[PDB]
């Protein structure tokens, strides 16, 4: 038999199968992983899909409990600039500009994530990371 | 293993039995087959015997099988490792 084992996963809303780390990380569970993709599919229906972090717990009698978090800003800077596949090399090529507001709204939306809980701080962490993916920023 | 009276006997990964027996200064002590103990009163003459029983049966063998100080196996391939 099996007892309480809280194990978390990292899964996008598009690959709904018992495939590692879906299965064996939550095999000692009877983890209803198809009721996790479904209860979370329409949950982040602010776009339809999005990639999202999760955490599903077993309680012996086939009990599954998943807690979730937001998508990334390695998609909220690329969706914040009009960069298609991305931007081939950081300190090299350029594709689609960002400004002092776009970066601000980005820094906003994802508040409890990033690292700090101070809007005038995580925003800096954003002010950097944009450069490491191949895009410029508009300063003033 | 089974220390009869004064003699330490064992038939490990070898055909015939083995007779390991007391030298001056130190003493054996078998708790059971799988974890033999030694009351050796001579830090120099004792470790000698330690690494000498361990040399009697060198462990490792890619995976496991053998005698260990507190020794930990160092991993390699079984029915593999043979291109």
């Amino acid at each position: 038999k099996k007892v309480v084992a809280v194990v978390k996963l990292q899964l996008p809303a598009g690959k709904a199968t018992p495939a590692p780390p879906v299965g064996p990380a939550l095999g000692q569970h009877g983890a209803n992983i198809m009721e996790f993709v479904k209860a979370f599919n329409a949950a982040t229906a602010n776009m339809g899909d999005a990639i999202v972090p999760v955490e599903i717990t077993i309680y012996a009698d086939r009990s599954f409990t998943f807690v979730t978090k937001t998508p990334p800003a390695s998609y909220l800077i690329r969706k914040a600039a009009g960069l298609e596949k991305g931007a081939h090399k950081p300190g090299r090529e350029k594709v689609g500009r960002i400004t002092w507001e776009q970066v601000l709204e980005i820094a906003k939306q994802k508040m409890p994530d990033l690292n700090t809980t101070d809007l005038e701080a995580a925003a800096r962490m954003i002010a950097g990371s944009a450069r490491s993916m191949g895009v410029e920023v508009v300063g003033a | 293993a089974r220390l009869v009276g004064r003699a330490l006997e064992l038939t490990v990964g070898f055909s015939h039995p083995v007779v390991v027996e007391p030298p001056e200064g130190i003493t054996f002590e078998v708790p059971e087959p799988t974890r033999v103990r030694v009351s050796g009163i001579d830090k120099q003459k004792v470790g000698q015997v330690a690494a000498n029983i361990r040399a009697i049966r060198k462990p490792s063998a890619y995976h496991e099988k053998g005698i260990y100080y507190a020794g930990e196996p160092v991993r390699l391939k079984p029915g593999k490792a043979g291109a």
């Binding site: 018992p18 495939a19 590692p20 299965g23 | 391939k77 079984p78 029915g79 593999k80 043979g82």
Partner: protein, 549 residues
């Protein structure tokens, strides 16, 4: 040494998931064995000496006496999952009897959900009659076994009703060759009654066969009787065409074909070429005298060059064959490895000349053509592009000009192999109202092509395969190892059952027989397939080594 109980019970469900549930326990492990306790009747069984001329039922010497109880309970416990009489009659107060438990346990032992654990060392005449008893009292009678199937002569599967008093329908199986009687054809019947001196109609081969005599084989002699009834099992003597995997019926019976269609493929593809030509014929005789007894492997002479491909499900298999071969028939076979099919292909857009013409007065034939011969990706298709301007080359000379190309592409300028995916084209030629023959411009296209490839940098193509492997995770990892360490690159994976697939690109040259190599990084527990996709350039270094004489 290493004897057990527990560990068997563990790995059973650590690899398959089938619950054992058990019927007896040892008296001492490795050689500490004297007799055997059981938990069925709860009687202290015991032999004495190994040969077992001195069995007994002496009292329980204590030690494990109590321990039998717990598992006994467990035994009884699982009896409460089937026969729900023993259920209350074990969870109330009374006792389960020595009889209805036989049917609870046989229930479990025909539903396939439980696994009465009897064991033992019959080296030393122990554990024998016990397992025999268990066998009679539990093993699935040919009664409750869900009936076999065999499509009517109309096109619809039909059930066999195993009454020895209905239509005579019969299956066969094992084909021996017995220097006394002969082609021993081991058969199991089904419905109706099998008589002697009668006749049978094998529905599969459509041939009507003659029962020369009846047979079963005992342990020490030939069991020659007269009749084998519906679903009784044995062997028929004297029956030619019949082999393994068949369906015979009564001479006038409803006449159907039993299913019994199976699929295990031959994995390893070996090559065999036994010296001269004096062998090839005897080899025909060999693979002849095989298949009827060995319908399990496949023989396909390399559909391009020589080498009869001998493909089988295992290196051993293939080797007991390669051995009986060299002994029974004599075939001094020198087994080699399969060739490959390579394909010439240029690199740069090269456009050369192919002229002809011979003037010694009269018919000497005219034929000047210059063509585009551009290339295509290593999977496209053979082409040509009518780039004729004013009809300079009279269109009617275009036909054979394209085959002269096509047949000067049969054998390239290098090794001599089918040039593929080289979108040719054409453009500018010439003519003469008379001299220009059909074969002349045939040669125009031909030679033009030849120069085009000789100059255009032809590199060598090679088959790229799809290996798709079944494996339990660990092996899976080290097999990602093996695969990528086999030249080309793999692809992916998925969890299929207790396994993980392996999608894989693999050039056949470095791939030659992977089954035995598979079972070395999977250590047996792996399976796979191999298939095809396209051809590709060798990473250069093989076109300087393969300049072989």
């Amino acid at each position: 040494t290493g004897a057990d109980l527990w560990l068997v019970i563990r790995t059973m469900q650590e690899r398959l998931g089938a619950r054992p549930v058990v019927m007896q326990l040892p008296i001492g492990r490795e050689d500490t064995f004297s007799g055997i306790i059981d938990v069925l009747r709860m009687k202290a069984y015991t032999y004495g000496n190994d040969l077992g001329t001195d069995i007994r039922e002496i009292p329980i010497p204590e030690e494990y006496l109590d321990q039998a109880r717990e598992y006994h309970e467990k035994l009884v416990e699982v009896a409460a999952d089937f026969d729900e009489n023993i259920m209350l009659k074990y969870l109330e107060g009374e006792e389960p009897t020595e009889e209805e438990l036989v049917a609870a346990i046989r229930k479990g032992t025909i539903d396939l959900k439980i696994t009465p654990v009897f064991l033992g060392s019959a080296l030393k005449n122990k554990g024998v009659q016990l397992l025999l008893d268990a066998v009679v009292d539990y093993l699935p009678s040919p009664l409750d076994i869900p009936p076999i199937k065999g499509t009517t002569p109309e096109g619809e599967v039909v059930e066999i009703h195993p009454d020895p008093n209905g239509p005579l329908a019969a299956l066969a199986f094992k084909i021996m060759a017995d220097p006394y009687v002969g082609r021993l054809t081991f058969i199991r019947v089904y419905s109706g009654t099998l008589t002697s001196g009668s006749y049978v109609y094998n529905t599969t081969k459509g041939r009507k066969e003659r029962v020369a005599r009846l047979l079963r084989m005992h342990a020490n002699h030939r069991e020659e009787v007269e009749e084998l009834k519906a679903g009784d099992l044995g062997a028929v003597v004297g029956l030619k065409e019949t082999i393994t995997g068949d369906t015979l019926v009564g001479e006038d019976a409803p006449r159907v074909i039993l299913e019994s269609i199976e699929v295990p493929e031959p994995v390893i593809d070996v090559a065999i070429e036994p010296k001269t030509k004096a062998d090839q014929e005897k080899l025909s005789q060999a693979l002849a005298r095989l298949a009827e007894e060995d319908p399990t492997f496949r023989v396909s002479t390399h559909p391009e060059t020589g080498q009869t491909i001998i493909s089988g499900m295992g290196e051993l298999h293939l080797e007991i064959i390669v051995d009986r071969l060299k002994r029974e028939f004599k075939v001094d076979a020198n087994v080699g490895k399969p060739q490959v099919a390579y394909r010439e292909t240029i690199t740069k857009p090269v456009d050369v000349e192919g002229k002809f013409i011979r003037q010694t007065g009269g018919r000497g034939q005219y034929g000047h053509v210059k063509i585009k011969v551009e290339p295509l990706p290593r999977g496209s298709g053979f082409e040509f592009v009518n780039a004729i301007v004013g009809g300079v080359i009279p269109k009617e000379y275009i036909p054979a000009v394209q085959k002269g190309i096509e047949e000067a592409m049969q054998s390239g300028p290098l090794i001599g192999f089918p040039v593929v995916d080289i979108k040719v084209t054409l453009y500018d030629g010439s003519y003469h109202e008379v001299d220009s023959s059909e074969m002349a411009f045939k040669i125009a296209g031909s030679m033009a092509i030849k120069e085009a490839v000789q100059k255009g940098d032809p590199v060598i193509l090679e088959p790229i395969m799809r290996v798709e492997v079944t494996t339990p995770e660990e092996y899976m990892g080290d097999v990602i190892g093996d695969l990528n360490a086999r030249r080309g690159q793999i692809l992916g994976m998925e969890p299929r059952g207790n396994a993980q697939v392996i999608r894989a690109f693999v050039p056949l040259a470095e791939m030659f027989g992977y089954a035995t190599d598979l079972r070395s990084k999977t250590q047996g527990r792996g399976s796979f397939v191999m298939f095809f996709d396209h051809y590709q350039e060798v990473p250069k270094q093989v076109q300087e080594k393969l300049i072989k004489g």
